[PDB]
Amino acid sequence: SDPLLSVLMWGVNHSINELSHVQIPVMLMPDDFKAYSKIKVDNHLFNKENMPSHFKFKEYCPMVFRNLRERFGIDDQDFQNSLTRSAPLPNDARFHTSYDKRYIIKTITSEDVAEMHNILKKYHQYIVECHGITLLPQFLGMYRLNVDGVEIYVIVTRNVFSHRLSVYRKYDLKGSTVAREASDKEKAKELPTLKDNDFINEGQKIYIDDNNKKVFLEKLKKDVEFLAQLKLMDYSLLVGIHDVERAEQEAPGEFDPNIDVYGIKCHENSPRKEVYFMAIIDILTHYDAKKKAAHATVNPEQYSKRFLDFIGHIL
Amino acid sequence: SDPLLSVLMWGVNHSINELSHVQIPVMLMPDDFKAYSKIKVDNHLFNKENMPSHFKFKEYCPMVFRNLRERFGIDDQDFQNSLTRSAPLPNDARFHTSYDKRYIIKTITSEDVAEMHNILKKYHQYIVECHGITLLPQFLGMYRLNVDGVEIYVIVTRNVFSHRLSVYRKYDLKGSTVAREASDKEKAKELPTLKDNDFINEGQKIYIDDNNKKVFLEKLKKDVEFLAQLKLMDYSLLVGIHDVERAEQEAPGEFDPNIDVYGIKCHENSPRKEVYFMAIIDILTHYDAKKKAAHATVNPEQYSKRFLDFIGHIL
C-alpha cells in the first residue's frame, strides 16, 4: 500500500539477511559507530506490483544495532519476521506498530538522526553497564528511506505496551511545573493519552508492592541521571494499565516478562486485577520544532530532579 | 577470493530471491525484453570480510531468463543453490563452472551483450517453438558486475558436458574449408580441445544408432537454419566422449537425461561403452576481436550448409 512502508520491509529483510552471513564478535570497534550500509535499486520495466521502481535504503551502524538487539534479548530472525511477514499498521510525527505489536516504528527528523549518532556510543555503553535492564527506549535499528522525491528517517524501538494484553488507560508523565492536561478534544479520543493533571485530578494509583516499587525507582534514578548527563530533557514516563476484568468482559491475565519487559503485576490487595507497563519515551531534543514553538526556564539537571520527584510521589 | 565472483554469487542470490516474490505469468510482454534490475551497494566501514565494499550488479531482462530457465526444466532454487552454495571454479575469454558442474559462466563483451539483446526475442520464440528441445546454448541469465574500477559482463549457460560423467576426449567442429587443427602446444594440454582435422586424421567415429542419429541431425538442421536466419556464424559443435571403462579404471555408466540433456548413449555394437555429449556452442559474432584478427570468404548461409554437410559425414 504505502511505498515507503514497502521499502522499509524490503530493507529490514535485506539488512537482516546480510548480517546473518557476517561473523558477530563480542565487541564493537569505534568504526562500527561510524558505519552504514547503502542500497540503491533501479528497476526498469520490472517488478512494478510489489515495489516502487526507484528507491534507496540506508542502514545506520548495522553492527551496533545488531549488538543492541541481542543485548535486549531479541533474535534477528524474530525481528525480521515481526517486521516483514506482514505490513506494519499505522495509527493517526507518524508511528507504526509491527503487525504482531512487538515493535514500534517512529518517523524522525534528520536532526534526530544526527543526535542519535551523537549519543549512540554512550548509550551502548550504558546498556552494557546495566546489562540491558533499563527503562530507556530500546533502540533496535535506524534507517533512511527514499522513494522518488521523498526522504524519511525511521527508528525502531521495542513496544512499551504488551503484544497480547490490551491497554485501557494511558498516561504520559513529565512532572513539569507548567500545567499538563489532555485537551477536552483529546480527553475524548478513542484510547486517549492523559497527562500530569489527569493523573493528580483523577487520583490514579499504581498498586505495585514495595519491592517492585524500589527496583523500579532505582532503575529510573540511574536512567534519568544518564539522560541528564547527556543534556537531554523533555522525556516522559509512559504508563499503560491493563484491566484483566475488562479484557475478560470484552495465562488468564499473566504475561511473558521476556516479551513484555516493561510489565509489572499489581500486588495482592489491589482493588482490581491490573498489569502496568511503564517506561521512558521520547528522549531526543528535536530542536527544529521546539524552535518552531519559540519563533511563532528549566535545564536538563532541573528536569531530571523534577521528573524524579514527581514519579516518586505518584507510586 | 575473486571479488567479481563474490558479487556474481551475491547478485544471483539477490536476483532469484526477488523473483520468488513476483507472480510469474505464462507469457512475456514486449517490455520484458527491454527490462533490467540494477543494484548499487555502498558499505562504509562494514562487512569487509565477505564482500567488496562498493559494487554494482545489473540483471538483464530478468523475466525472460526466468521464463527460459523454466522452459529448460531448471528450477530457480536449484539454479540459485548451484551458483551460490559454493564458489564457481575457473579453468585457464575466461570461463567458470558452477561448483556442482551443472552450469557454465562465461565472460563476454559489451558487444556480445548488445547482440544478445538483439536476438533475445527471436531466440525465445525459437525455444517456444521447439519446446526447449534444441542443440543451441541454453541461455540462463545475463549480468553486469562492477567492483571499483572493473566492469564485466557474464552469461550463464547449461553445461554441455555431464555433471557426473567425466569427459576424456573433446572436439570442437566447424566443418570449415580452411584447415583446423589443435596446436602441437594444444594437442598436449591436460584435457585438450581437438578440431576438424584431429577428427578426420584420427578417424574418430561416433557409435549412435540410426534413430538417435536421425533425431539429432533433424534438431541440428532446424537449429542451424535458425542461426543462419539471424545472420550468425562461426559456431561450433562441441563433442565430448565419456569412456565408461576408463572412468571405472580410475547407474554404472548411465546418466540422467533431465540433468545431462545433451547425452546420447552408444549403440549395442559399439567397440567400447561410450556416452556422447554434443551441442552447438559460441553463437555470437564478437566482431571486436574478429576485426582485431583482420587489422593485425564464407557468409552465414554458406557456413550453415558447410557446417551441416560436415556433421552429416562424421556421424
Swiss-Prot record, chains A, B:
Q: Which UniProt keywords apply?
A: Acetylation, ATP-binding, Cell membrane, Cell projection, Cytoplasm, Kinase, Lipid metabolism, Lysosome, Membrane, Nucleotide-binding, Nucleus, Phosphoprotein, Transferase
| Annotated control of activity | In rod outer segments, activated by light. Inhibited by I-OMe tyrphostin AG-538 (I-OMe-AG-538), acting as an ATP-competitive inhibitor.
Q: Which residues carry this modification: N6-acetyllysine?
A: 56, 106
Phenotype upon changing residue 212 to S: No effect on kinase activity; increased accumulation of lysosomal cholesterol
PTM remark:
Phosphorylated in tyrosines. Phosphorylation is induced by light and increases kinase activity.
Q: Which residues form the PIPK domain?
A: 1-315
Tell me which Gene Ontology terms the entry assigns under biological process. Answer: 1-phosphatidyl-1D-myo-inositol 4,5-bisphosphate biosynthetic process; autophagosome-lysosome fusion; megakaryocyte development; negative regulation of insulin receptor signaling pathway; phosphatidylinositol phosphate biosynthetic process; positive regulation of autophagosome assembly; regulation of autophagy; vesicle-mediated cholesterol transport
Q: What effect on the protein does mutating residue 99 to F have, as reported in its record?
A: Abolishes catalytic activity
Entry's InterPro entries?
A: PInositol-4-P-4/5-kinase_C_sf (IPR027483), PInositol-4-P-4/5-kinase_core (IPR002498), PInositol-4-P-5-kinase_N (IPR027484), PInositol-4/5-P-5/4-kinase (IPR023610)
Q: In which tissues is it expressed?
A: Expressed ubiquitously, with high levels in the brain. Present in most tissues, except notably skeletal muscle and small intestine.
Molecular functions (GO terms): 1-phosphatidylinositol-4-phosphate 5-kinase activity; 1-phosphatidylinositol-5-phosphate 4-kinase activity; ATP binding; protein homodimerization activity
Q: Which PROSITE patterns match?
A: PIPK
Pfam families linked = PIP5K
Q: Coiled coil located at which positions?
A: none
The EC designation for this entry is 2.7.1.149
Family annotation (SUPFAM superfamilies): SAICAR synthase-like (SSF56104)
Its subcellular locations are: Cell membrane; Nucleus; Lysosome; Cytoplasm
Q: Which reaction does it catalyse?
A: a 1,2-diacyl-sn-glycero-3-phospho-(1D-myo-inositol-5-phosphate) + ATP = a 1,2-diacyl-sn-glycero-3-phospho-(1D-myo-inositol-4,5-bisphosphate) + ADP + H(+); 1,2-dihexadecanoyl-sn-glycero-3-phospho-(1D-myo-inositol-5-phosphate) + ATP = 1,2-dihexadecanoyl-sn-glycero-3-phospho-(1D-myo-inositol-4,5-bisphosphate) + ADP + H(+); 1,2-dihexadecanoyl-sn-glycero-3-phospho-(1D-myo-inositol-5-phosphate) + GTP = 1,2-dihexadecanoyl-sn-glycero-3-phospho-(1D-myo-inositol-4,5-bisphosphate) + GDP + H(+)
Where do the record's region annotations for Required for interaction with PIP5K1A lie? 26-32
GO CC terms in record:
autophagosome; cytosol; lysosome; nucleoplasm; photoreceptor inner segment; photoreceptor outer segment; plasma membrane
Instruction: Provide the assembly information.
Output: Homodimer. Interacts with PIP4K2B; the interaction may regulate localization to the nucleus. Probably interacts with PIP5K1A; the interaction inhibits PIP5K1A kinase activity.
Give the function comment from the record: Catalyzes the phosphorylation of phosphatidylinositol 5-phosphate (PtdIns5P) on the fourth hydroxyl of the myo-inositol ring, to form phosphatidylinositol 4,5-bisphosphate (PtdIns(4,5)P2). Has both ATP- and GTP-dependent kinase activities. May exert its function by regulating the levels of PtdIns5P, which functions in the cytosol by increasing AKT activity and in the nucleus signals through ING2. May regulate the pool of cytosolic PtdIns5P in response to the activation of tyrosine phosphorylation.
From the Swiss-Prot or TrEMBL record, give the protein name: Phosphatidylinositol 5-phosphate 4-kinase type-2 alpha
